[PDB]
Each structure stands twice: as structure tokens, then as C-alpha cells.
């Protein structure tokens, strides 16, 4: 069956252009009731709404800053009586070599990207819980996953978003609230990522807590792997940095690495290590 | 040969107790000139006192080492480095360890609950590190430690603010690793497990007393030693065990075909492939990621 969002209210932030607008247009065309938001920095959002209405879809605009998150969800509620999907897309760039990053260059990036997504997602959270339905998208970036010269501020905010999502996955799974994160990328058409966002935000999708790099027509998934590592301490004998150095190769050897999935498992391993030594 | 830090100046933020304290004592015992910083407040973000830092500096002195205290909040990062510059004249290593908790279920995290965690953990580390950056570049040497956590890596109920800040620190380090390379400035991240005032509520009491901060100090000392070459690593450490983490990426799927609109249904149809990790690759750079997307265009056309 073709992917429809009929009756689903979808809030997209920073949807005045690029990726956002492309999601706004992709969603509405499949029956979604879209709340198009964009700080317009008011004509930015209005233009996309128009495109949607003209296309035979339904939508309304919101002109507030994601910093004013509560307001973006209010527009979804006051206009459609609910909120099902939140795509956190709003973002800006303030690239500088690390030493030249001013306090403001840092703060503004955290405010729009991270604090913005926290405010908006927090405003919709209880509504999603009470109704037992929610699909959330966080927009990370390769610069966050890998790092990238001149983007210390941006890379920290993007991975911070992943951290936020990891927890939301835990707190929301019981109420059918899914949260996934993407790292998207002239020829790199925004319509090449939109389909992944639509799938990840569909009611038939069961993916929760995934991290995805998207671009050019390709999609890949990322996860952590951890080395079996080494116990470099013996009971009654103080642990030394020399033991760490002398076991460095083993500690860093990824052969048969585990694929850790929760904090419990990690904590459980540490407690078992303590028991083996004792 | 035993690892020493003679002639090295080490700044440890939040060295008044727990992990920070164990690090400062270990460094000082090995010859390092240590600036022990601590705001002297509680683990919830309320308070200020000079005794936290003063006691550690006293313990170090009694053990025959040399240290000086700094009482500023990491939020005033630049001042910690100044204490290092004014007292010893250089700054070789920065261990960003200062931290607090403000646990609440997501819906109940207030704006201040969020902002204060970010200010101290992330913004504070950025401030302290940024203040030492040019000094390390001039010295053509530097060792930096960011303290993340398992809750940031895996997520953890009631800590959305904390977990975002902690992985946020990792994204900061990812970049510092690239920018500090030519100047021998290494930056590594750790996710420690040690019993402290900050962990009682998530650890049976006896487990608290048994998971010593002294079991993680050894790793921190090695990663900050001149002879260590590790740069940009992420390590989980506790009880005497150490392990390393890294990303693995699926080979994935090209769901788009030449002149044929890409659809959501196509993505759904290639889901098993997209999520299969057999022969996954181990990506390490944004350039290789960008090179890859560009190769996808070529393969398709
Ligand atoms: N296009 C690409 O290659 C990549 C994009 N990304 C991320 O994708 C997202 C959007 O990317 P693009 O469309 O390419 O960029 P963009 O800059 O065109 O889109 C951001 C949108 O955010 C809106 N905005 C800015 N501040 C706002 C605020 N305070 N409140 C509400 N809206 C606000 C802007 O008006 C703009 O339309 C961002 O989060 C960006 O970091 C990440 C990696 C690569
Ligand atoms: N112990 C554990 O199992 C884990 C610890 N961590 C992290 O390790 C670090 C240290 O944790 P613990 O030693 O266990 O806790 P702790 O509470 O004993 O030590 C933290 C120290 O930071 C100081 N501090 C707080 N806010 C400060 C500020 N603004 N400026 C300067 N100093 C400040 C406190 O006074 C305290 O001495 C933190 O960043 C924590 O989030 C992360 C995961 C697990």
C-alpha cells in the first residue's frame, strides 16, 4: 500500500527552503496536515504553504523561532487539534577556526539546532504520549559524526542532537513515539533525502533510534561497535598508567567487537569485570 | 619506562572530588604542575566554596607534589587557563571533567534544567579548551580530554539534557581532533564509570564504594602523556577494564534509479538491505563520506 499521511499533523521546522520545504511538499502531497514553520531570516513560510495549497494539499504557517518551540506546536494544535510528526530541520552556520569562535558564534548555533529541537520536541511530547503516537526526526550531520574543520560549534550541536534522540527513544517507545536521526547531504537534491524522512515518519515504520547518512539516492545506517577490551588491573595491586600502555594494542583491537545497545548492558559489563577481578 | 609529566602543566576542571580529584593526584604524583579547579558547589548546580579545591591542593602538597587552586566556574573558562599561565607559565593538558546533574523525565525538564547542564558540560568545556588552544598551538603540543558518558552514547531514562550534552562533547572533540593535528594537539573522549556523589542514586551503595575513581585515572594519564599517539578515540572505562568504541556503517542501498523519481515506498522496499551490517565499513572522515555520496551519483548515471 502506498505511504499516506492522511489525518496526520506534521510540523516541519525551518521549512521555508531546502530540505524543510522539500519535506513539507512531500508530506502534504500524501495527505498530511502540515504546519510549515520558518523564522524568515514571514514570506518564507507563506510561500511554501501557498505551493502546498496550490498543489491540492492542506497547510498553515508559523513564523516563530524554534527557540519559541511551544508556539510552533500551539499552531498545530490550535489549527488541527493534534500533532503527530515533528521534523526538526531548522538550522544555521557560523563556521570559524576553533580559536576564532566567539561566545555568540557558539551560543547561537546551540540555540537554533539543539535548544531549538529540545523546545519544540518538548512542547509536543505529552500530546504524543497521551495519544500513543509520535514520529520525530532529528537532523544531525556528517560534521557531527566525523568532525569537520571550522565547525566545532556546529559539530557539537549536531552530535548533541543524537544524544537527545538516544534518550527520547527510551522514554517514548512504550507510547509508540519513535525518534530517528539523519545526517543528510546542486546535484545533491533535497528530494533525495525527503523519501527517507517520509518512511521514518510513517505509522507503518517500526524503526526507532536509528542513525542514517542520506544523499544522492543512497542511504546507509550507522551503529557503535566496541572492542572486548582488556582488564588491566589485578586485585590488591594498584592500577598504573603503564599497564594501560602495555595493553594498548589489546584494548584497541576490534576483532569480534561487541555491538553494545543499552546503558544497562554497559553497566552490567563493568560490574561483571569487578567480580572477575575480585 | 614509567610515564612522567615533568615540566608539564595540567589543568583539571572539577578536581575537587570524584574523578577530577583522582586525576589531579595521579598527575601530581608523576611530576606534573597541576592547576586544580573546582567551583565548590553541589552536584545539582547549587553552591560555591573554596575548600573543595583547597583540600586537593593540600593533599597534593602533603604527597610531595605541586599544585595551585582555581575557584572559578568553568563557565568563566578563560580564568582557569590564566591561573595556569600566571602560576606556571604554560598549559600542556586540559582535562574537562567538571559536571552536574539535573535529571527529570523529558516533559519535566525545565528550561533552566536544560540550559544549566549545557552551560557547565558543553559550553564550559568549549570555553576552557578554547582558552588553551592558541597556547597549545604555539607550544606545538597539547593533550585534551572530554568527559562524555554511557548515557550520552546509549541514551538513558530521565537524562535527555545530560545525554545530549555528553554526546555534544564528543562532536566537539571530533573537530578539535582535525584542527589540532598539525600541532600535535590530541583530543580523546572518555565515558567513565566510578562511584561518586553523582552516582549514588544510580548505583547500589556498595557498588559506589567499589568502583573507584582511581580505576579510570590510569587511562586519563596515558591519553595525556607525550608518548601517547591516540587521537580522537572514545573509550568506556571502569573497574579496571577499558574498551574502545567506533562507528560502523552499512554498505547500504542506492534506492534511486536514473530518471525515475525516488519514492518513500522504494526506501521501505530496501529496508532490510539498508539496515544490514554484513561487511559494514568503518567510516572515519567527512571527506570519505562526501567522496562516497559523489560516487553514488556516478554509479547511478
Ligand atoms: N543541505 C545539506 O547539505 C545539509 C543540511 N544539514 C542540516 O539540514 C537542515 C536544513 O538544511 P538546509 O535546508 O540545507 O539549510 P537552510 O539553511 O536552507 O535551512 C534552514 C532553515 O532554517 C530556518 N531557520 C533559521 N533559524 C531559525 C529559527 N531560529 N527558527 C526557525 N527557523 C529557522 C531558515 O529560514 C532556513 O529556511 C539544518 O539543520 C542543516 O544543519 C546538515 C548537513 C548537510
Ligand atoms: N562517575 C561516573 O560514573 C560518571 C561520571 N561522568 C562525568 O564525570 C565527571 C565527574 O563526575 P564525578 O566525579 O562522578 O562527579 P562529582 O560530583 O564528584 O565531580 C564533579 C566535580 O565538578 C565540580 N563542578 C560542578 N560544576 C562545576 C563548574 N561549573 N565549574 C567547576 N567545577 C564544577 C563539582 O564541584 C565536583 O567536584 C562529570 O563530568 C560527570 O558527568 C559521566 C558518566 C559516569
PDB file of C-alpha atoms in Angstrom, chain A residues 1 6 10 13 16-17 20 31 44 57 75 83 96 104 106 108 124-125 138 159-160 182 187-188 210 217 267 270:
ATOM      1  CA  UNK A   1       0.000   0.000   0.000  1.00  0.00           C
ATOM      2  CA  UNK A   6      -3.948  11.383   5.698  1.00  0.00           C
ATOM      3  CA  UNK A  10       3.137  17.193  10.576  1.00  0.00           C
ATOM      4  CA  UNK A  13      10.777  23.464  11.263  1.00  0.00           C
ATOM      5  CA  UNK A  16      10.995  27.814   4.048  1.00  0.00           C
ATOM      6  CA  UNK A  17      13.631  26.275   1.803  1.00  0.00           C
ATOM      7  CA  UNK A  20      12.468  21.530   5.092  1.00  0.00           C
ATOM      8  CA  UNK A  31      -2.419  13.845   2.689  1.00  0.00           C
ATOM      9  CA  UNK A  44       9.491  32.342   3.666  1.00  0.00           C
ATOM     10  CA  UNK A  57      -2.861  19.852  -0.051  1.00  0.00           C
ATOM     11  CA  UNK A  75      -0.096  26.367  15.825  1.00  0.00           C
ATOM     12  CA  UNK A  83       0.489  16.844  16.377  1.00  0.00           C
ATOM     13  CA  UNK A  96      35.208  29.632  12.250  1.00  0.00           C
ATOM     14  CA  UNK A 104      27.923  34.236  20.351  1.00  0.00           C
ATOM     15  CA  UNK A 106      28.834  29.212  19.832  1.00  0.00           C
ATOM     16  CA  UNK A 108      23.557  30.893  18.552  1.00  0.00           C
ATOM     17  CA  UNK A 124       4.798  18.099  21.579  1.00  0.00           C
ATOM     18  CA  UNK A 125       5.917  15.284  23.902  1.00  0.00           C
ATOM     19  CA  UNK A 138      16.439  14.963  14.428  1.00  0.00           C
ATOM     20  CA  UNK A 159      26.010  15.183  17.803  1.00  0.00           C
ATOM     21  CA  UNK A 160      24.287  16.705  20.822  1.00  0.00           C
ATOM     22  CA  UNK A 182      19.570  11.716   9.876  1.00  0.00           C
ATOM     23  CA  UNK A 187      23.175  17.666  -7.771  1.00  0.00           C
ATOM     24  CA  UNK A 188      22.553  16.732  -4.153  1.00  0.00           C
ATOM     25  CA  UNK A 210      18.307   4.806  14.038  1.00  0.00           C
ATOM     26  CA  UNK A 217      19.942   8.466  -3.747  1.00  0.00           C
ATOM     27  CA  UNK A 267      26.929  -1.120  33.270  1.00  0.00           C
ATOM     28  CA  UNK A 270      31.566  -3.167  34.309  1.00  0.00           C
TER      29      UNK A 270
END
